């Protein structure tokens, strides 16, 4: 069901603070895939420092038994959004209701994602 | 001294802070901002109970 699974580690925060009361655009370079990532994470609710590692899954469903619209509850940062731009060294553009994502990596790792589809975002800090 | 009302006190037998009369805070964020200005953002966390009035 899951079409993307990798182990990310962050390198930069865009506000780079503690109590800015805003969203933080993280910069996470991944191991063994050379993939760059932009993601707006709510630091005040879900804390993320600079140096820690976290896994990331991207599945179009959650119940893992078909039924395209019992669930995956092994993560802690489950989100949902749509992919609206696959304009490519390919790069994705996913918006989770206002929070933008930019999954830029090799063109062979990201090839099963279609246009204007609904996909989730699963994350866990090990 | 950064609190408006008498919420936090000082323990003379321990030389540390305590909480006496906790229902006198009036939800004016004066000690959380002082702790964030002192470089301790996770020092004092005050949340309201949704089931106790």
């Amino acid at each position: 069901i899951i079409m993307f699974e990798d182990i990310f580690v962050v390198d930069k925060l865009d506000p780079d603070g503690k109590k800015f009361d805003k969203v933080t655009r993280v910069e996470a370079r991944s191991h063994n895939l050379e993939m760059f990532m932009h993601l707006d994470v709510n630091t005040e609710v879900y804390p993320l420092a600079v140096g820690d590692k976290f896994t990331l899954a991207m599945a179009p469903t959650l119940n893992l038994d078909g039924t395209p619209d019992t669930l995956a509850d092994k993560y802690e940062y489950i989100m949902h959004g749509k992919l609206y731009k696959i304009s490519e060294k390919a790069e994705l553009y996913v918006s989770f209701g206002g929070l933008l994502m930019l999954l830029q990596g090799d063109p062979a790792h990201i090839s099963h994602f279609e246009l204007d589809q609904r996909l989730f975002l699963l994350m866990r800090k090990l | 001294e950064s609190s408006p009302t008498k919420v936090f006190g000082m323990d003379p037998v321990t030389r540390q802070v305590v909480v006496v009369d906790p229902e006198a805070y009036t939800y004016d964020e004066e000690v959380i901002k002082k702790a964030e200005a002192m470089g301790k953002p996770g020092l004092i966390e005050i949340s309201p109970k949704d089931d106790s009035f």
């Binding site: 780079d16 603070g17 503690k18 800015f20 600079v50 140096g51 | 200005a37 470089g39 953002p41």
Partner: protein, 136 residues
């Protein structure tokens, strides 16, 4: 390991150098900061987003780098990020023994065929800074 001048990536633009100096001397040891310089676009009223700090030894510089890599330098809700600078703020060797203070300097040339020395002038109470990295 050549220089001790450290450039901070993101300092607040509403501060003065004394507020950063007291913060660095509160987290690290007392009076362990030698030089501190915040560059300004204007003359004296518009500081920039970065600053250069020069420490007194290499151990406190490595300790500040270890504190910055572990995200333990929070100065007014700003996480300080240390990097490497281009040159020292003051060309001073980081060694307590290389800075020879209050010594006698004399000039001249060997006069006779032996290894003698005739002095024209004499300078008392001069400094001596042996810059190994700058090779002078």
């Amino acid at each position: 390991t050549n220089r001790s001048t450290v450039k901070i990536s993101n300092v607040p633009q509403t501060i003065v150098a004394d507020e950063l100096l007291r913060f660095l001397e509160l987290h690290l040891g007392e009076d362990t900061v030698f030089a501190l310089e915040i560059p300004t676009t204007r003359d004296n009223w518009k500081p920039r987003d970065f600053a250069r700090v020069q420490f007194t030894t290499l151990e406190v510089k490595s300790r500040a780098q270890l504190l910055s890599s572990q995200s333990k330098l929070l100065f007014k809700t700003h996480n300080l990020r240390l990097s490497e600078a281009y040159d020292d703020i003051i060309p001073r060797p980081v060694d307590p023994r290389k800075r020879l203070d209050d010594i006698v300097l004399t000039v001249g040339f060997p006069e006779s065929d032996e290894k003698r020395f005739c002095a024209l002038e004499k300078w008392d109470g001069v400094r001596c800074w042996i810059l190994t990295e700058k090779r002078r």
